Design a protein around this ligand. Structure first.
Ligand SMILES: CC[n+]1c(-c2ccccc2)c2cc(N)ccc2c2ccc(N)cc21
Lengths: 183, 185
């Protein structure tokens, strides 16, 4: 099972969804097409199980990391920096948008992806709701500002080889510009 | 000739996407051969870059025309972002571009050319801020960095916003643009 997932993960990271064939996963992960079935049934179901795991891993990683930032202003900066460095979730965004746009008509897995989408945004909701409570800023629509922050950041992370220190400088600058736009 | 292959390839990429579209399909419908395709455009991937280049030029024309209606650079920024959102919402190639990008964002040969293309969209932002600096509307130390940030952030909002209802999508882009400029001051 774990042999199939990891190879699935990296193949999707490198080549995206469509280009990664079920056979190529079965080829490199030394297992039958019938062994992937029963465990995962279908390639789409395989993909959703990977995203479920990725969100948890990311969520746990952030659960432990946010403790390191006192104020919510710092939690924003820090969260945004981690999204660069992390190995969870953000490296699969290309595949996620590739997968999202095809199967957005099918609601069985659309709903599931909104479920996953809500949690990836909720991190920002808490940060801004908490900032409001502790007088760090004033926001009347935390939901809107959360949606914007997440996707803006996801934009910087996905679209910007590339020097890792330079990406952090750019992200810190974004973080600065955004927070001071609230103030 | 070369144009008929580009013409048909766009339609196939629009109809069926990038991955499902083959070179053989493009060939037969163009009255051509795989030999000729190879000669003009080398790979399927390079053919698709030639189409995106042509599309970039059409986009540049559209911005040349539409940007005249925005007096200040501050207003050009709002409009650029909003137009990016709206245009891509009904732009047919978008799905094919998504497939291609996600497939070739890690390939040095075609990765350099993609960067060349994306940088042209980024340069629009460079004009706006530089002109804004001169015109007294703000004061930005690193125009190069801030433009990269603006562009990639805006494109994130355009690409990842899974929430339907295009009225709200405009409301959020406008709010972003407000927040972003408010933070420059
Ligand atoms: C959809 C084309 N496209 C890309 C793009 C995305 C992926 C690959 C190449 C270009 C783009 C990329 C960045 N960074 C910033 C802005 C834009 C952009 C802006 C407006 C538009 N109308 C199309 C745009």
């Amino acid at each position: 099972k774990d042999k199939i997932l990891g190879v699935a993960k990296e193949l999707f990271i490198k080549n995206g969804y469509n280009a990664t064939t079920t056979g190529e996963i079965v080829k490199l992960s030394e297992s039958s097409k019938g062994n992937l079935y029963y465990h995962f049934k279908t390639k789409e179901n395989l993909f959703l199980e990977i995203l479920n795991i990725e969100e948890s891993k990311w969520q746990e990683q952030w659960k432990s990391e946010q403790i390191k930032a006192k104020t919510n202003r710092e939690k924003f900066y820090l969260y945004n920096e981690l999204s660069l460095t992390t190995q969870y979730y953000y490296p699969l965004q290309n595949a996620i948008i590739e997968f999202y746009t095809e199967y957005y008509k099918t609601n069985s897995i659309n709903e599931k992806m909104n479920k996953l989408e809500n949690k990836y945004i909720d991190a920002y909701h808490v940060i801004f709701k908490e900032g409001n409570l502790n007088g760090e800023w004033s926001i009347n629509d935390v939901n809107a500002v959360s949606k914007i922050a997440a996707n803006a950041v996801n934009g910087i992370v996905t679209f910007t080889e590339q020097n890792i220190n330079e990406r952090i400088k750019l992200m810190n600058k974004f973080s600065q510009i955004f927070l001071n736009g609230l103030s």
